[PDB]
């Protein structure tokens, strides 16, 4: 009976790994800023590209939930 | 290690190079200990009025005092 | 803190005269603004030159250094003595050896830990320090002191 | 000039190399040993002890061993016009391995252990341990 | 009818990743600050930006859970 | 509702990801205090900010659990 | 509609590892750029090759969800 | 009275998740004492603060286990 | 084919470890290239070798998925 | 031979985390010893304090496992 | 019955733990090569020993994925 | 009907964390020996202590698995 | 009874964790040999000790799996 809700909840679990990846990204960002502020403006650019993948994958996950909570 | 014992890197390097020089072969060891002879005469002052004068012929006693 | 390098034997022309002249100039320039000056020296000639006029400022003097050949061990001792008395700014006066018939007196404004902590060392960000910068800096600085004394004394000799 | 590695291996008493062109140079960093070649990034490193191993461009296979106690290494990028990348290995005592001995090494190790048995000062213990390190390195490095 | 509660709990079993990412963020911030204090004003500036995503993900990690309790 | 008792446990499982993060954060704090001690007053402040999130997140991981024990 | 959405969510659970790998890879990119900007363009390239695996695997993963939604 | 025991056993995961994190904290303390033996205090205080936080989290999880075991 | 579909879905959790190993390899490659670009190609060789193993593992699970999708 | 055995088995999942924490502790001890042997007797001391939690925490779960085996 | 196929899908979960080991080993190879290329061909040999274990520990479970499928 | 086997297999699963801890410990040992080769006896002693703790936990979980199997 | 297969398969998951440890251990060699290529011998000894322990763990896991299979 609770098929759709359970499946959506199980699908939503990858947000943890997504957040871990984003944390690693921004940790490397702050570390590279501490190691060389002169190229700070460059590093953030690459960091955004990482988000351009990570959140995108995350977005797909949420879409699947929207597909699965209503069949 | 030397930073924790309250020691300078120069002191550590010198006191280790001394041991390395002790691990030399005699023909080269003579020249090594020859080019690394030490003699100093420190003279401490405080607005004139010399507090002390002391000689040094060894690296260890030179760094300690 | 003014480290004046000089000799212990006479008949050396007038190189120690120029060294002591530059030292007097530096002391009289920096004592007006109110900077408390200390004097380290190498050789008895600078001592005889500055005893009567600036003998109330000596901190530590070394001599009999030119007896045996100059070596890095002789310089490390003086560098350690300078570091144990860590001042806010250090100057080094010596004679540069241009050619066999020409020298030149110089003054080296030397970096110190007080002056290093007040800078973020952004200029060295291009260099990859294998240990972290904060862990290797104190050793690089001691090496810098020793090498400075070494080269300066060689040129003076 | 050329796209080689401009090594200068220098001790206070003798400069063994000044602008020697080589291919690769191994050095015992404080973290671990590492081999510098052309294209290597700018870097500064502290050395602990051990056997520098030089390899000239003409040699390739032939090498040169040199024991170093302590010091620094400075790798500096190549200027745009020079076309060659430089490296400076400063050592407080840079000996060749041919001039080393394994018996006096063990004798000095024994005397160090004797002196450090009365462990009271931190510097004495530290010196005993570091001497053990360097003398074991000399023994393993000597021929 | 506790299957809705089960789905809400499962969807809520991903805040651990958000927490790990935030810990990595602030750990790298503190490390890079101890390495170079003078640049703190920049290290914080990027850090919040990372949070500007992570907490938002965390909000999703909450919202659907509440939805899974009712819908 | 027996399944409610399971739901709460699952909602508590996230603490395993929480505490890890907290640990990592304080670890970095100690490393900083081992590198540049003279700015402890800075680092702890930033550390508190991190806790200001994590504890709050942890509270959520508690609250719904208790809610899931009743609803 | 049990097995369909169940298998979909279960297969979708494995994108967190993809996100973690992406985060680690881009963190290495940022650090390398901080240490050696002169070969910046030479690093970005390699990271794209990594995507040529990771995202592709993720794509397969997502595709399998659809293959399990209308099997 | 069968589901309560399973709920408690499932809630016990945060114990291992917390021991992970206490280990990291004390490892950082050890490394800090190795890099700067001159500072033993000001490392044990922060360590004890983190210990208090993680002990509170463990107390929460054990309390909820005992609760669900009889409720 | 319900239980078969569930088996095929459960088969695809190992993809996370594959992606994590891939990220580790490419991170190490990027860092080594940031250190010594002159050993680019050689490193690439070693990298590809490791990737082959991971790729094989990936393909293996995919094959099993097909098996568990039909048999 | 029922649910009590399942619960007492599920309680044992925390031993992995406890073992990882102990491994991190003693790895940090070993590293600190290799770095600065001259404070060995100090580091071991702190290490024991860590055990004063970690092992104890593990024991708790083990005890609770028996509590879940004869509840 | 078909339920046995699930056992096969469980036997492939050890895969994706082997992948992290292979990744770590080959990443260490890459880093040690970038640091000291002079000894390249030695380090490769050591990896041939490591893969001597992991390459078995993977396929062994895959054999179980067959043995616990048809039986 | 065969629930004891399930409980035993579920209890055995902490060997993963035990092995992770052992590997991290011996990796720290090997690194500290590569750095400070004149200090191997003390490092080996601390490694033996850690291995004793970890083997104790492993034998505990194996004994509990045997108990739950042949209760 | 095919169900007894499942339990055995579950034990194999532990082997995955074991592989992770092995990888880390060998990395410590492959880095150490690059960090100190003079020795290459005692590191192998400690590696073999750790591998003996981990192989014993994996072997008892496999044996318990076969036992729960046939029994």
Residue numbers in the entry:
A (entry chain I), E (entry chain H), F (entry chain Q), G (entry chain J), H (entry chain P), I (entry chain K), ...: 96 to 166
B (entry chain e): 1 to 65
C (entry chain g): 106 to 262
D (entry chain d): 41 to 183
Which of the paper's sentences describe this entry?
F-type ATP synthases are energy-converting membrane protein complexes that synthesize adenosine triphosphate (ATP) from ADP and inorganic phosphate. These universal enzymes function by using the energy stored in an electrochemical potential across the bioenergetic membrane by rotary catalysis. In mitochondria, F1Fo ATP synthase resides in the crista membrane where it is known to form dimers, which can further assemble into rows critical for inducing the membrane curvature and maintaining membrane potential and morphology. Here, we investigate the mechanism for the generation of the unique cristae in the Apicomplexa, using a combination of single-particle cryo-EM, cryo-ET and subtomogram averaging.
Masked refinements of the ATP synthase dimer resulted in maps of the membrane region, the OSCP/F1/c-ring complex, the rotor and the peripheral stalk, ranging in resolution from 2.8 to 3.5 Å, thus allowing de novo modelling of the respective regions. The attachment to F1 is mediated through OSCP, which adopts a fold conserved in prokaryotic and eukaryotic homologs. IF1 in our structure is bound exclusively to the α/β-interface facing the dimer interface, thereby locking it in the ADP-bound state (βDP). The N-terminal IF1 region that contacts the central stalk in the bovine complex is absent in our structure. Because central stalk rotation and conformational changes in the catalytic sites of F1 are interdependent, the sterically restrictive IF1 binding in T. gondii to only one of the three catalytic sites results in the trapping of the ATP synthase in a single rotational state in both the dimer and hexamer.
